[PDB]
Scaffold this active site. Structure first.
Site, PDB file in Angstrom:
ATOM      1  N   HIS A  88       0.814  -1.130  -0.018  1.00  0.00           N
ATOM      2  CA  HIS A  88       0.020  -0.047   0.126  1.00  0.00           C
ATOM      3  C   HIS A  88       0.959   1.177   0.063  1.00  0.00           C
ATOM      4  CE1 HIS A  88      -3.552  -2.478   1.172  1.00  0.00           C
ATOM      5  NE2 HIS A  88      -2.690  -3.152   1.971  1.00  0.00           N
ATOM      6  N   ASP A  91      -1.425   8.908  -1.469  1.00  0.00           N
ATOM      7  CA  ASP A  91      -1.398  10.031  -2.389  1.00  0.00           C
ATOM      8  C   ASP A  91      -2.514  10.991  -1.857  1.00  0.00           C
ATOM      9  OD1 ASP A  91      -2.314  11.854  -4.510  1.00  0.00           O
ATOM     10  OD2 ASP A  91      -2.387  10.149  -6.032  1.00  0.00           O
ATOM     11  N   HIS A  93      -4.144  14.572  -2.276  1.00  0.00           N
ATOM     12  CA  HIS A  93      -4.428  15.515  -3.394  1.00  0.00           C
ATOM     13  C   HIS A  93      -4.027  16.945  -3.126  1.00  0.00           C
ATOM     14  CE1 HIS A  93      -7.597  13.146  -6.176  1.00  0.00           C
ATOM     15  NE2 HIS A  93      -6.435  12.413  -5.863  1.00  0.00           N
ATOM     16  N   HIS A 128      -5.876   8.944  -1.098  1.00  0.00           N
ATOM     17  CA  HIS A 128      -6.046   7.470  -1.309  1.00  0.00           C
ATOM     18  C   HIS A 128      -4.776   6.637  -1.620  1.00  0.00           C
ATOM     19  CE1 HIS A 128      -5.701   7.709  -5.746  1.00  0.00           C
ATOM     20  NE2 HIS A 128      -6.110   8.936  -5.546  1.00  0.00           N
ATOM     21  N   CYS A 129      -4.955   5.377  -1.376  1.00  0.00           N
ATOM     22  CA  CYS A 129      -3.979   4.380  -1.709  1.00  0.00           C
ATOM     23  C   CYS A 129      -3.890   4.341  -3.302  1.00  0.00           C
ATOM     24  CB  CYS A 129      -4.221   2.918  -0.983  1.00  0.00           C
ATOM     25  SG  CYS A 129      -2.662   1.903  -1.387  1.00  0.00           S
ATOM     26  N   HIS A 138      -7.625  -0.882  -4.927  1.00  0.00           N
ATOM     27  CA  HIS A 138      -7.342  -0.290  -3.749  1.00  0.00           C
ATOM     28  C   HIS A 138      -8.465   0.753  -3.435  1.00  0.00           C
ATOM     29  CE1 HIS A 138      -3.664  -2.217  -2.252  1.00  0.00           C
ATOM     30  NE2 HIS A 138      -3.856  -2.724  -3.480  1.00  0.00           N
ATOM     31  N   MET A 143     -10.118   2.353   0.216  1.00  0.00           N
ATOM     32  CA  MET A 143      -8.810   2.953   0.741  1.00  0.00           C
ATOM     33  C   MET A 143      -8.382   4.170   0.547  1.00  0.00           C
ATOM     34  SD  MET A 143      -5.330   0.807   1.398  1.00  0.00           S
ATOM     35  CE  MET A 143      -4.100   1.902   1.821  1.00  0.00           C
ATOM     36  N   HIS A 248     -27.267  16.040  -1.312  1.00  0.00           N
ATOM     37  CA  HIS A 248     -28.524  16.714  -1.039  1.00  0.00           C
ATOM     38  C   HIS A 248     -28.971  16.644   0.261  1.00  0.00           C
ATOM     39  CE1 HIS A 248     -32.324  18.531  -2.321  1.00  0.00           C
ATOM     40  NE2 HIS A 248     -33.066  17.596  -1.295  1.00  0.00           N
ATOM     41  N   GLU A 272     -29.452  23.196  -3.683  1.00  0.00           N
ATOM     42  CA  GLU A 272     -30.646  22.227  -3.717  1.00  0.00           C
ATOM     43  C   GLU A 272     -29.460  20.670  -3.429  1.00  0.00           C
ATOM     44  OE1 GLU A 272     -33.683  21.363  -6.335  1.00  0.00           O
ATOM     45  OE2 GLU A 272     -32.835  22.640  -7.775  1.00  0.00           O
ATOM     46  N   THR A 273     -28.799  20.753  -4.626  1.00  0.00           N
ATOM     47  CA  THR A 273     -27.899  19.519  -4.742  1.00  0.00           C
ATOM     48  C   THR A 273     -26.724  20.055  -5.429  1.00  0.00           C
ATOM     49  OG1 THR A 273     -29.893  18.228  -5.258  1.00  0.00           O
ATOM     50  CG2 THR A 273     -28.013  17.459  -5.969  1.00  0.00           C
ATOM     51  N   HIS A 299     -28.510  12.504  -4.625  1.00  0.00           N
ATOM     52  CA  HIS A 299     -29.426  12.505  -5.395  1.00  0.00           C
ATOM     53  C   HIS A 299     -29.650  11.896  -6.661  1.00  0.00           C
ATOM     54  CE1 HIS A 299     -33.677  14.134  -5.978  1.00  0.00           C
ATOM     55  NE2 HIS A 299     -33.596  14.531  -4.420  1.00  0.00           N
TER      56      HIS A 299
HETATM   57 CU   LIG Z   1      -3.649   0.125  -0.623  1.00  0.00          CU
HETATM   58 CU   LIG Z   2     -35.311  15.089  -3.743  1.00  0.00          CU
HETATM   59 CU   LIG Z   3      -6.303  10.661  -6.925  1.00  0.00          CU
END
Ligand SMILES: [Cu+2]
Ligand SMILES: [Cu+2]
Ligand SMILES: [Cu+2]
Ligand SMILES: O=N[O-]
Ligand SMILES: O=N[O-]
Ligand SMILES: O=N[O-]
Ligand SMILES: O=N[O-]
Ligand SMILES: O=N[O-]
Ligand SMILES: O=N[O-]
Ligand SMILES: O=N[O-]
Ligand SMILES: O=N[O-]
Ligand SMILES: O=N[O-]
Ligand SMILES: O=N[O-]
Ligand SMILES: O=N[O-]
Ligand SMILES: O=N[O-]
Ligand SMILES: O=N[O-]
Ligand SMILES: O=N[O-]
Ligand SMILES: O=N[O-]
Ligand SMILES: O=N[O-]
Ligand SMILES: O=N[O-]
Ligand SMILES: O=N[O-]
Ligand SMILES: [Cu+2]
Ligand SMILES: [Cu+2]
Ligand SMILES: [Cu+2]
Lengths: 332, 332, 332
Positions: A88, A91, A93, A128-129, A138, A143, A248, A272-273, A299
């Site tokens: 494993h 990373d 972001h 994330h891995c 992964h 993960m 939502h 709303e969303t 939603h």
């Molecule tokens: Cu992993």
């Molecule tokens: Cu709705």
């Molecule tokens: Cu990424």
């Protein structure tokens, strides 16, 4: 010189809770030290008892929310105990260089590593891995998590005025791709290597079998419902490491939303969303105005109510009949 | 009077490269003359040798990036040689009227046409073939590209300050729908007419078999990796004529992003990932801060790493240990 | 005191038309009274004659567009006649509390109810049925619409200047999931209860069989094409209660677009295509500049041209050869 900076050790908490932090930085830049231990474990993800082999940071899906301020340094000790079977890494972001840290953090079982990076951009970000050749397996095994890099002077609205939350929750949304046979029942497997090709086949369908919050259908319900009171200001951080989602709050709104999660931008108002793209974290701020049960959902309502992407808020307080009322209750 | 304007002939280049142009207009409005020749050709799109009958503008998937300034006129000579079999046309999302030009540009094999339109809106825009009754088949066979209409005073940031790129690349992302039999192997076909109903069936699944940059799995890797140096300002234009994508630079960011591609809007800052809707081009500006390999991906990581939507940048220069460092390398 | 406010009764119209209203409020806050009658009915949704059991507000898919101003009260009388078979309710994304009203509006056949809520946020918003345990089935059977809450001083552009539309249309986009057998033909069913598990199975594929505007393939074409004249300012409200869409006017633009529908935010300018997330309504403003036929589509062109998500505008007026012209018509 980084060695002249304060160090502070953070003790992480399980989602959807978030470790204690200050919105407005009370110190200068710091090295913020985190430790996470990778755990491969069986997880029951639905009401039918479907069990998968999850790959986790710190035992949970999602991994915990890390919180720092802009221009702090994040120092992560990542431990892969010898009770695990796979290689494993991690990373971020939020980070710059070396594939977000993934190129520097490859740990076989029985190994650990420490990565430091400067959190130069404010926002919520996925981590994330991402092991070379095995990345989506992964990530879609759980993960992934998120990190919030707060501006040093805290959040601001579209006019530059402060926005201060009273509560924060972290909702990680996970798409699982549990392999199915031709009748449509899930398969299981005896080893990760024996599962791999059918995991790939299942992923290639692009059709998740489950889409869940906090690791399982119903995880954010009942005794584990999210809570608030009327008048409380709540920030909900929501991440999806692999697939678009559209959060939502049923019965509410996103009063201020950073759909793609980056605090240097003005928030979108009165949503709303909103669309959080796969590979992103977003954040929504809402002030509750009514008590009762709310559902917080993706939603695509099939994803929410058939595949698992739904949780609840339980909100206490006074009902406002000006905002909403039943004039004539259902009757013949 | 358009005949009193300067004419300039552009010679296009193959993606991901972009023909030479000026960011800030060095002349007044011009008629910018382009020529593209349609080519139907076999293309191998994956490492397994899967071969499709591609439909291209100028021999490439995507078609080349055209670059003009706002209020220039675009004059395109479109040639459909008699060695092709199908009717084609072109629709510019940058243009106004006649279905973007498609209604005026229908060319049988052995025909050509010339279209002129005024580029009244700044931004990056999709262009694609769109023959009546056959639109998604042509588009999903590769037969799309983009045009950039720069503001006459070049790009600007969210505060109105100039943003000047040192390098520009055009990443066209293509969803292919290669028909599969009931065991899941690709079919081939003996004529376009014999392929058509199963192309439609395959498209109707809404599940691409391949999602590639620059026309094939791995096209933007190895000797054909994108390149930059630390400190260089890079603009990456990314288009998707048919399906949403979510670009992400692994190890980097979009410092300034026009996710939906239109330069009159302020860019979004500090993006990890952004959503470019199907039928849109977007653009992201980044200043490299670290050397090494980066992966540029669609951050549906299944789409990236299993279906092909991943390329590489190779970046030269000095490593910055303040931004990122391995404190303790992986060890027992 | 709400009883001291004016009441005004609105008589709704069938989409894509919109009931008469004022953009700038000509009165103070009002209680705006609406009535909708639920109708379960057979609907033919495609050219092949595929017939489904639709669930509708007011007989149409989508339900009608309701229009009020910010801080008006919406008072809806919802009628479920005894000729229907199912329980229904209504959830307004514009409202605050009680799951948008759904918790207060559960009506068995032979019942009615009246809900009042304060429209505290300006924007276009989805409304939909949402009976506990059955939510996506009702929504994906057609049983959704939208409400527009205008700012009291009407719409404004990114600089705060008025934007006044001459015409408004409401395009509801509906994803249907018609169950298929293993050869791929649609099934029908003898009762809603007998259809339910296969409706769920079909929905779980996440792959719509049909995606239509105004309830059927081709509904917004021919005699029912949308219309405008050159120079007219048109607002197109577009909703999707369950699934992302990406509207695009072929041959035109969204001059001002609120992709996620909320008018307190500045619009995005000069859009080619925009992403309206599932569970959202959006709005686009365009001033026509050329006559002729336009296609208004979801720019997943498979969804548009194979699954049904396409309509037409017929625009009258003078052709502008400065904006676009055929220099050399197609020829050998
Ligand atoms: Cu992993
Ligand atoms: Cu709705
Ligand atoms: Cu990424
Ligand atoms: O502190 N420089 O990113
Ligand atoms: O909690 N301060 O607004
Ligand atoms: O084909 N059975 O997984
Ligand atoms: O469909 N979302 O990646
Ligand atoms: O592009 N679907 O994740
Ligand atoms: O990323 N800005 O929401
Ligand atoms: O120059 N008028 O678009
Ligand atoms: O290259 N001028 O900033
Ligand atoms: O059913 N064989 O394509
Ligand atoms: O799923 N993107 O069109
Ligand atoms: O709506 N999927 O392209
Ligand atoms: O289209 N503005 O990114
Ligand atoms: O009028 N208070 O929402
Ligand atoms: O119609 N007034 O701009
Ligand atoms: O399996 N026939 O629906
Ligand atoms: O794929 N749209 O929900
Ligand atoms: O996430 N697809 O609706
Ligand atoms: O929701 N603002 O488009
Ligand atoms: Cu073509
Ligand atoms: Cu198009
Ligand atoms: Cu209903």
């Amino acid at each position: 010189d980084i060695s002249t900076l304060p160090r502070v050790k953070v003790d992480l908490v399980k989602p959807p809770f978030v470790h204690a932090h200050d919105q407005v930085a009370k110190t200068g830049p710091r090295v913020v030290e985190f430790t996470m231990t990778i755990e491969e474990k069986k997880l029951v993800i639905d009401r039918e008892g479907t069990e998968i082999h999850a790959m986790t940071f710190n035992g949970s899906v999602p991994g915990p929310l890390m919180v720092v301020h802009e221009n702090d340094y994040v120092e992560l000790r990542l431990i892969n105990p010898d009770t695990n079977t796979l290689l494993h890494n991690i990373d971020f972001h939020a980070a710059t260089g070396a594939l977000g840290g993934g190129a520097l953090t490859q740990v076989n079982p029985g190994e650990e590593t420490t990565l430091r990076f400067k959190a130069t951009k404010p926002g919520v970000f996925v981590y994330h891995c991402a092991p070379e050749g095995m990345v989506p397996w992964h990530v879609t095994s759980g993960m992934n998590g998120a990190i919030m890099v707060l501006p040093r002077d805290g959040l601001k609205d579209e006019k530059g005025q402060p926005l201060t939350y009273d509560k924060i929750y972290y909702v990680g949304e996970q798409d699982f791709y549990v392999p199915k046979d031709e009748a449509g029942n899930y398969k299981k497997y005896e080893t990760p290597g024996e599962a791999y090709e059918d995991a790939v086949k299942a992923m290639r369908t692009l059709t998740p079998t489950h889409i869940v919050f906090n690791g399982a259908v119903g995880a954010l319900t009942g005794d584990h419902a999210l809570t608030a009171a009327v008048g409380e200001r709540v920030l909900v951080v929501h991440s999806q490491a692999n697939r678009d989602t559209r959060p939502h709050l049923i019965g509410g709104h996103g009063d201020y939303v950073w759909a793609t999660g980056k605090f240097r931008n003005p928030p979108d108002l009165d949503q709303e969303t909103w669309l959080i793209p796969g590979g992103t974290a977003g954040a929504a701020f809402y002030t509750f105005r009514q008590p009762g049960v709310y559902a917080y959902v993706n939603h695509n309502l099939i994803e929410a109510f058939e595949l698992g992407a739904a949780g609840h808020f339980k909100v206490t307080g006074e009902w406002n009949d000006d905002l909403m009322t039943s004039v004539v209750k259902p009757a013949s």
